[PDB]
Design a protein around this ligand. Structure first.
Ligand SMILES: CC(C)(CO)NC(=O)c1cccc(Cl)c1
Ligand SMILES: [Zn+2]
Ligand SMILES: [Zn+2]
Length: 582
């Protein structure tokens, strides 16, 4: 307790010595509260006018239009300590999993050099605004790095002064850039060196890309076994126990020298003890602490979520296979049985899963998995939208399984070759592309964001009639040489000024390991769509009068946007489609 967080608390007290008060009407039950101080401040979602002017039929679809308008009583909950048999299952499985992940990888510190290059190319590293304006400025200034140095030497001493979270079914914990650097230095290797790649972790999909995920789910479906299970956890980050954080910290067992101590201090001082500042309107700033739950950078959060989810799902598989009888207590011989299962079939059982942070798909050996709930519930990974002891509903067809907010279609090209394509309700895709984040967008920057969405659609969603047409319209309405942009940057092959047919051929044919025949496609007309009825099921407006008028008059919409942007060099991409081609 206060010996580890006090210094951090003491430091904040003094910067607001005029305003410090132990408010008695504090709303916190499960967070330790410390004090309050005076502040006064808050970033709503703005509409992309280029995408909206080119998707007029959706102006009257509430599922699209409502997306642009606008639980902290789940963060203030507590997770019971697992039973002794559960804690043993988790510790044995975590020990074994870090060894497997480490067999072909070497833990290493990430560098000021690597950190500097990340900030100078815009990655959402979740920092705050003070002394320097942006992160770009702090990184060039040697004063900053002396702050980092002081904190760094404080960590080697097992102490912390400035690593404090700022809060804002989502919760984002911004720290100052210095704290983020020290996190990245000690634990960035997990992401930077691809510890959760499918090649390295067997269950993971890190670096895989939305054009690979459907092929991966179809490869899992080829295994002998039961239904495919895709249970979502209710508020995964809030159900991370202190026992989970201690099994995650065992990655330090594989480190040496400085790195080992630096990583040990991140886990001890920032993860297993947290200090947070929350805006309360009653407007003050509350300074609260707690030991458990997930609160890290979103990239470290992704890798440790993937790790702990792999662990939890292997234990649920052990339960269904009868490896252990009860979570109350493992016998001496049940421990050897669990260890022996991992050594004997552990890698096979990892290959039966696709895991992306808190998101999983599992094809177990058989359907006993469905009712194997004791370890899963006792680890605190309680399933969403089903009763605690009700058996899981599995999927019989890999094309029906939800994963990473998508489902996947099998689509046969006129030449017989097989595409496995990503898909989701088309209202969600159009409604997201109509939204921008942040202020001070020029018309050119708004246009370049519209172009990024359009090129993603051409590469990922070419099989949806409305999106291939709207993508062609946007690429025709934006100057040909203007470079696609984003403010928060999966592999993003659509972020390029290369010809989109050339990118399509590289991604779906040349570099696709599931495609044996490498014959390039010569035009967009060789590239198929879903069946007309399947396109409607997944939200297409084909068949509506609004959509027919929009498609027929599309050059008028394109010309409206060209007239707003002005006298620039444009290309007509509409004749790439069979029915605008004379
Ligand atoms: C993809 C093309 C341009 C050519 O076949 N159009 C369609 O497939 C389409 C469009 C509107 C309505 C219906 Cl039913 C089909
Ligand atoms: Zn610190
Ligand atoms: Zn679909």
């Amino acid at each position: 307790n206060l010996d580890i967080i006090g210094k951090r608390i003491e430091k904040i007290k003094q910067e607001h010595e005029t305003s410090w008060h132990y408010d008695q009407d504090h709303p916190y039950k499960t967070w330790a509260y410390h004090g309050s101080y005076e502040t006064k401040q808050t970033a709503s979602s703005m509409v992309n006018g280029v995408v909206r002017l080119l998707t007029k039929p959706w102006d009257i679809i509430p599922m699209v239009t409502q997306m642009a308008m606008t639980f902290k009583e789940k963060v203030d909950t507590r997770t019971q300590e697992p039973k002794e048999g559960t804690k043993k299952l988790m510790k044995i499985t975590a020990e074994w999993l870090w060894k497997e992940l480490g067999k072909k990888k070497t833990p290493r510190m990430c560098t000021r050099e690597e950190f500097t290059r990340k900030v100078r190319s815009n990655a959402a590293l979740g920092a705050i605004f003070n002394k320097w304006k942006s992160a770009r400025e702090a990184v060039e200034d040697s004063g900053f790095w002396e702050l980092v140095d002081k904190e760094r030497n404080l960590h080697l001493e097992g102490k912390c002064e400035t690593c404090v979270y700022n809060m804002m079914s989502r919760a984002i914990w911004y720290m100052w850039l210095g704290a983020r650097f020290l996190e990245f230095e000690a634990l960035g290797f997990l992401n930077e060196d691809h510890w959760f790649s499918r090649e390295n972790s067997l269950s993971g999909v890190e670096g895989e890309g939305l054009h690979k995920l459907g092929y991966i789910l179809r490869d899992v479906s080829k295994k002998e076994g039961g239904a495919m299970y895709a249970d979502d956890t209710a508020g995964w980050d809030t159900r991370i126990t202190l026992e989970d954080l201690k099994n995650e910290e065992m990655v330090t067992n594989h480190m040496e020298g400085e790195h080992k101590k630096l990583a040990e201090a991140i886990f001890k001082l920032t993860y297993q003890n947290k200090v947070v500042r929350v805006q309360r309107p009653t407007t003050v700033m509350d300074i609260i602490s707690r030991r458990d739950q997930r609160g890290s950078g979103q990239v470290v959060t992704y890798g440790l979520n993937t790790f702990t989810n792999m662990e939890a799902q292997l234990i649920r598989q052990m339960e269904g296979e009868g490896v252990f009888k009860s979570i109350q207590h493992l016998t001496v011989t049940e421990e050897i049985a669990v260890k022996n299962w991992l050594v004997r079939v552990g890698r096979e059982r990892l290959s039966r899963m696709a895991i992306s942070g808190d998101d999983c798909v599992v094809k177990p050996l058989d359907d006993r998995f469905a009712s194997a709930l004791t370890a899963l519930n006792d680890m605190g990974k309680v399933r969403k939208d089903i009763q605690q002891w009700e058996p899981s509903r599995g999927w019989n067809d890999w094309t029906q399984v939800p994963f990473c907010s998508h489902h996947f279609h099998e689509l046969i090209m006129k030449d017989g070759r097989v595409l496995v394509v990503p898909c989701r309700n088309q209202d969600e895709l159009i409604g997201r592309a109509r939204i921008s984040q942040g202020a001070g967008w020029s018309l050119r920057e708004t246009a370049c964001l519209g172009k990024s969405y359009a090129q993603m659609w051409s590469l990922m969603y070419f099989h949806r009639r409305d999106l291939r047409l709207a993508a062609n319209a946007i690429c025709s309405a934006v100057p040909s040489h203007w470079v696609p942009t984003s403010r928060t940057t999966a592999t993003h092959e659509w972020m390029t000024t290369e010809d989109m047919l050339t990118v399509w051929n590289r991604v779906w044919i040349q570099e696709n390991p599931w495609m044996e025949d490498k014959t390039p496609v010569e035009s967009w007309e060789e590239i198929p769509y879903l069946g007309k009825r399947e396109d409607q099921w997944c939200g297409s407006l084909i068949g509506l009068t609004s959509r027919a008028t929009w498609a027929k008059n599309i050059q008028t919409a394109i010309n409206q946007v060209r007239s707003l942007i002005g006298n620039e060099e444009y290309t007509d991409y509409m004749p790439s489609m069979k029915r605008f081609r004379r």
